[PDB]
Subunit: 206 residues, 2 copies
């Protein structure tokens, strides 16, 4: 509609944005593309990454910037950024811990030495996350926020993608509240659609 | 003093926050500590990182969240996040590119000559991307100081110096059109000058162990 979301459902970062869009009840069309280094794509997305949000003939190309922007131009509940400034800091912190300290490192695994080195980094990252999450029932508290966008998109991937490498050792197993949060989020229409599209794509490609 | 900033002036993430505090004219005390995994520190800074902002016995421990917070509660000029939402997005994009695609890669090095070439092409890629969104007119995102100047001045100044040893005629930053002039302009300002000065004072002292 007024909004186009450029990028396939294979991308954690695309799914992050898609979650916030769906929860806001916004009309949008998802354009299913892969990242590209083609000059013409670099004009709208300088690093050649997805997702890219498009609206009013203009583009935003960082998933964080995108959701902060949607938050600002569509300020109605659910507010991706809480009105309470302390609660907002907690939400941004959770999203940053998940992306920078969990996902980035986990992207070394998606060799033996690395698996080991990576497993320890994730354990540390998970023990830190544990200190700021509430899961009551949402990741930062009792309402949906930007942190649920990052949390459901990134952690559902981490958990699944690493269940074979850490069969009895899964770092995310140390995150109290996660399995139950994951189940709860999947009962909601937005995250269920996000998960469905991802599963379809993964059955297709496999 | 209402605001306490925990972390030493040699950290670019501390300096990123310090630039924003100084530019708004806020009063703060800087508490010099180094990163740490002591259970005492982890209680206020889960990853053991600096900076941590302390106010009213409450702690915020990621530099981006700190500056978004300070800009919300202390909205006096400059607005680190512009009021125009499209301008705000561009400010956030610039800051992300500088931190995630320039500094994180660079930290692989400055913190295998093969690795030196991987990092080199990655940085050149990041710079050409950055070149696309910067304005330097005179600030990095336009005619007023923003969050992107905190990230820009804090990270790029460090990237510039710390990488000349590695890339003598090869420096990625030399590709950023306007950087040298911006860096000179910023140093004419009291806040950025003070950040550079505090960094210099501690470096000189540390060098003599
Ligand atoms: Cl798709
Ligand atoms: Cl991705
Ligand atoms: Cl210091
Ligand atoms: Cl640092």
């Amino acid at each position: 509609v007024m909004i186009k979301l450029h990028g396939a459902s294979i991308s954690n970062y695309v799914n992050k944005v898609k979650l916030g869009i769906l929860e806001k009840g916004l009309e949008y069309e998802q354009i299913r593309i892969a990242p590209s280094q083609e000059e013409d794509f670099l004009k709208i997305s300088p690093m050649g990454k997805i997702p890219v949000l498009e609206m009013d003939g203009k583009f935003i190309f960082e998933s964080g910037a995108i959701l902060e922007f949607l938050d600002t131009i569509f300020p109605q509940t659910p507010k991706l950024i809480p009105e309470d400034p302390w609660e907002a800091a907690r939400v941004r912190e959770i999203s940053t811990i998940i992306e920078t300290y969990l996902d980035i490192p986990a992207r070394r695994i998606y060799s033996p030495e690395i698996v080991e080195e990576v497993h320890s980094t994730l354990v540390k990252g998970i023990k830190a996350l544990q200190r700021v999450v509430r899961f009551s029932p949402y990741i930062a508290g009792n309402v949906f926020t930007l942190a649920d966008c990052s949390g459901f998109a990134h952690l559902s991937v981490l958990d699944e993608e690493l269940r074979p490498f850490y069969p009895n050792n899964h770092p995310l197993d140390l995150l109290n509240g996660w399995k139950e949060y994951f189940v709860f989020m999947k009962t909601k229409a937005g995250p269920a659609l996000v998960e469905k599209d991802k599963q379809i794509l993964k059955k297709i490609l496999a």
